[PDB]
Amino acid sequence: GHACPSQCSCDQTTVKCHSRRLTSVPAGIPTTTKILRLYSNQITKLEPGVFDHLVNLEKLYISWNQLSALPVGVFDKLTKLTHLSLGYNQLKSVPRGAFDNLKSLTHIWLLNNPWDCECSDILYLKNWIVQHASIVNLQGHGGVDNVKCSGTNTPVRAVTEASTSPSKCP
Numbered sequence: 001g002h003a004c005p006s007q008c009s010c011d012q013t014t015v016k017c018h019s020r021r022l023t024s025v026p027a028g029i030p031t032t033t034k035i036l037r038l039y040s041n042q043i044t045k046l047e048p049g050v051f052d053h054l055v056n057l058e059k060l061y062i063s064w065n066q067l068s069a070l071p072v073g074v075f076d077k078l079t080k081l082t083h084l085s086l087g088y089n090q091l092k093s094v095p096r097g098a099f100d101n102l103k104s105l106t107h108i109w110l111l112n113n114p115w116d117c118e119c120s121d122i123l124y125l126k127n128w129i130v131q132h133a134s135i136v137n138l139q140g141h142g143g144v145d146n147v148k149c150s151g152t153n154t155p156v157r158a159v160t161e162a163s164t165s166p167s168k169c170p
């Protein structure tokens, strides 16, 4: 069954693509998928729309990669998502409104990214983690104060807008 990507193992609605030295999200993840494990790989980029067919997805683990950014709208179709891990990546910000369609989210992991607290792109993440602090970095991952600024390890929630500039941005 090539409904299952050759690089992953598919246990009904649970797709195991983790710990497989992958450099991109495999194409053809089955639309039945409720749990997608993509953690512990060599992914640096997500293609725009890569998850859009996974309308049933409840858990998305993409921690322990080298993701340098998120495309605009990449989570917008995942309206059933309860769990999202982005920990242990190379993210400097997330696009404005990245989480806004994730109305069912109960758990997010954002620790151990080089969040760029000098750049105004940080402000959506800062406001969002203050608003949704109770779901951030749960299960012994250090909570909302473990979303930390690159270089200083100051909690992102402590960043004042007056500390940021659009001109210190990529």
Ligand SMILES: O=S(=O)(O)CCCN1CCN(CCO)CC1
Pocket (backbone or CB within 6 Å): 039, 061, 063, 064, 085, 086, 087, 088, 109, 110, 139, 141
């Ligand atoms: O993915 S991270 O390492 O950033 C955070 C780990 C999150 N895991 C918590 C425990 N569950 C399993 C037990 O509930 C899997 C996800």
